[PDB]
């Protein structure tokens, strides 16, 4: 049913964006995560001036976006607890020419300004999920280590295409490459020997 | 001129709703003002300010750069009613005027939001990519 994968800190997905560039006036990223670790990179897309970086940082959800002329950084956290509580949490990030929106469970922020510029929402370089090469620190990544925990239904969507990255990794795609080996289920995180 | 205007932000939980608007005004004398208005309803603390791009995004219990606050007006109404006994609702309207000396124009907007269910900090730098 749902496309899930468990990352153990040495594994990541990489969807080849070189031979198929992506451009749009708006885009959207959705995923659910479950984890016990305080820090870890969940998703990065973009090696250009444009990028989106989504990570856990000290048990908070961290989002860093470079949307053309401007930059956005947010940190989100429950008040009496953290997001590395071994429970699923749902993330949705929406960008367009005038506005960025992020929601994590019961909190939503929408922020924008009049840009008055011609810009392109795209990325040439690989779309990374769950981690990234160790000798490759990605633009705007606040954390330096790969994810440990579960990611589910990672989907990137724009006005041209919709990529079910979690599904593609589970099934297979010549542009979808997996570093290491990951189980396409959510393992009991309390026991990650 | 400037790379942006008519800044807006909305942060929403079921416990606190925050609406922010921001406006720039170039006075033509080497200074410009940034005006923030914000309205919040519910429970929790909210703040909006100007910061340099080097400001670290982090949570904080407390409350070179050529911008300073010249005027601030805050109106806060508190309604106390017990839920099941306690319990309260806060309505807040703030206006803040920042005055900036123009030689430096790379300013960021920093918003904090501490409710009873969620907390969020965010930094928006609208023309940062004119910095480098």
Residue numbers in the entry:
A (entry chain A): 280 to 378, 394 to 487
B (entry chain B): 118 to 180, 191 to 212, 217 to 263
What did the original publication write about this model?
This electron density map was of sufficient quality to build an atomic model of Nxph1 by automated methods. Visual inspection of the Nxph1‐LNS2SS2− structure revealed multiple key interface residues. Among these residues, I401 of LNS2SS2− interacts with a particularly deep hydrophobic binding pocket in Nxph1 (formed primarily by Y249 and L251). Mutagenesis of Nrxn3 LNS2SS2− residues, corresponding to I401, T405, and Y407 of Nrxn1 LNS2SS2−, resulted in decreased co‐immunoprecipitation of LNS2SS2− with Nxph1. Of these mutants, I401Q had the greatest effect on Nxph1 binding to LNS2SS2−, nearly eliminating the interaction. Nxph1 binds Nrxn1 LNS2SS2− with nanomolar affinity. While glycosylation of Nxph1 may stabilize its binding to neurexin (Reissner et al, 2014), we were unable to produce well‐behaved Nxph1 without glycans on its own and thus could not assess the effects of glycosylation on Nxph1‐neurexin interactions. The I401Q mutation in Nrxn1 LNS2SS2− greatly decreased binding of Nxph1 to Nrxn1–3 LNS2SS2−.
Our data reveal a unique, extensive, neurexophilin–neurexin binding interface that extends the jelly‐roll β‐sandwich of LNS2 of neurexin‐1 into neurexophilin‐1.
